[PDB]
Structure formats: structure tokens, C-alpha cells
Amino acid sequence: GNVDLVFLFDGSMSLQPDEFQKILDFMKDVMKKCSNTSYQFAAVQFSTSYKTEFDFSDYVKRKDPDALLKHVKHMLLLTNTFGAINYVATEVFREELGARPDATKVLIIITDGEATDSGNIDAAKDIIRYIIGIGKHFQTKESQETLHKFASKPASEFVKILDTFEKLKDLCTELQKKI
């Protein structure tokens, strides 16, 4: 029943300060609701570059989402989603970072725009992948559909297109129900 969950969250230049803070608050809320469970967490900010803001070992030690994220600095650059997902798959889901070999791997990708880079995410395909596309850049169907390649199948389950986070059916509950 162990789940190792990574939040992979956009820090691009398009995010207003309140919008970036709402992404932080969303991750904290999921963690608080899912705390003291078989879930362990890590979080990675991506924009141009990728930074593990806290790893699974950190999570087990402090178990305080506000302290784990207190040092995050909004990167304010690009949206290199291909590089970021590869980074998570190969550099974050590792025993050296506290990941548990027995656990089910889950990736929650949070983004406010289309990917600026290119390539493939072969190395991450066996991870259960949800993508949340937040805000105005996903107002047309075409834009939304560009996120399907990053998510598990079917997109009707794994791609979430949101005006705001409050409209999402509660993620901790849904994960505990389904994973």
C-alpha cells in the first residue's frame, strides 16, 4: 500500500506571485490531508532547470509541508517539461533520495502552460502520471490536448484542466480511493 508521490510543479515566468503561492498551498494541502499515511512525498520545481525542493528522506524526517517548502524560490523562466519529467524519473525516484522500492510511483505534474522543450518521456511511462493544467493558457481544447502526452491513460482520468485549484475533486481523497 506504499505510495511514493512526486509533485513536479511549474515555476515559469507566467505565474503571478499569488498563482505560484497557490501552487505551493495546493501541494501543502494534499500532504496535510494525506499525512501519517503510507504516502511519502517529494517535490521538484521546474522552469528552465529542475530543483528537488525536498526529497522523500526530508519528508520522513520533518513531516511538515510548511517547513519542507519554506525555502522555495520561484524560478521565473521557461517550462521544460520533457527535461523535468525525465529528471524525476531518473534522479528523484531513487533509493538514494529515500524512495522505497516496494512503493507505487505517482507523479503529479502542475503546470500553467505548454512545454517549451521537446523529446520524449519514455523513462517515466510506467509511473502513474496526473497532469493539472491551470489557468488561461489552457482555454482552448487544442492547448489542453498538448498535455495528454505527459499523463497516464486515459486522459479523461489523468488530465485535469482547472480554472482554480478549488474546483479540483479533492486529490488526496481521489488518490487514496484509486491508487
52 binds Mg ion (CB under 5 A): no
80 binds Mg ion (CB under 5 A): no
* CB distance 6 to 88 below 8 Å: yes
Q: Which residues pair with 162 in a beta bridge?
A: 134
The span of 4-12, 48-56, 97-105, 158-166 binding Mg ion (CB under 5 A) equals 4-12
How far is residue 178 from each of residues 14, 81, 93, 139, measured CA to CA in Å?
A: 32, 25, 21, 28
Nearer to Mg ion, 23 or 92 (CB): 23
Sites for Mg ion among residues 14-43 (CB under 5 A): 14
Nearer to Mg ion, 14 or 144 (CB): 14
* CB distance 107 to 124 below 8 Å: yes
The span of 5-13, 87-95, 119-127, 170-178 binding Mg ion (CB under 5 A) equals 5-13
User: Can you tell me the distance from the alpha carbon of 21 to that of 16, in angstroms, rounded to the nearest whole number?
Assistant: 9
* CB distance 47 to 9 below 8 Å: no
12 binds Mg ion (CB under 5 A): yes
* CB distance 158 to 151 below 8 Å: yes
String marking each residue 107-146 x if it binds Mg ion according to CB under 5 A: -----xx---------------------------------
Instruction: Provide the binding-site residues for Mg ion, judged by CB under 5 A.
Output: 12, 14, 112-113
